[PDB]
């Protein structure tokens, strides 16, 4: 009653985090572990997390897209929800872009592919999978 997978507006899948943390797009909302949750610390950026196993998302110190496991700042997010919907999500601190989040494809997401503040990569639909 707190998870939600990320899903996106680019073809409509789930982020999640398989094994490595590997971010990617699954349709399955039923997957017993694609779940994610949305929710930020303080400022316009956030922390997501990966699965209900209370972990969280965060750029591959490069510009890949990975589960996040530890705080800091590396591991935080953006915050933009247009009207009221879906989110924006992947960053850090700073604004840039250039490592937005996005999701599509099949499964594996969007690693920083052309992110830009309102791309669907970025914009992504919560929701309140959770179980009931």
């Known amino acids: 009653q707190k998870p939600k997978l990320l899903y996106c507006s680019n073809g409509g899948y789930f982020l999640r985090i398989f094994p490595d943390g590997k971010v990617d797009g699954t349709r399955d909302r039923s997957d017993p572990y694609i779940q994610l949750q949305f929710y930020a610390e303080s ?21 890949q897209l990975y589960a996040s496991q530890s705080p800091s700042e590396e591991c935080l997010f953006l ?12 960053s850090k601190v700073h ?3 250039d490592w937005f989040v996005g999701i599509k494809k099949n499964g594996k997401t969007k690693p920083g592919s052309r992110t830009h503040f309102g791309q669907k990569a970025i914009l992504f639909l919560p929701l309140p999978v959770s179980s009931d």
């Open 95 to 97: 604004a840039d872009k």
């Open 79 to 90: 915050e933009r929800l247009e009207e009221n919907n879906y989110n924006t999500y992947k």
């Open 43 to 63: 400022v316009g950026e956030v922390y997501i997390k990966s699965l209900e196993t209370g972990q969280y998302l965060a750029m591959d110190s490069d510009g």
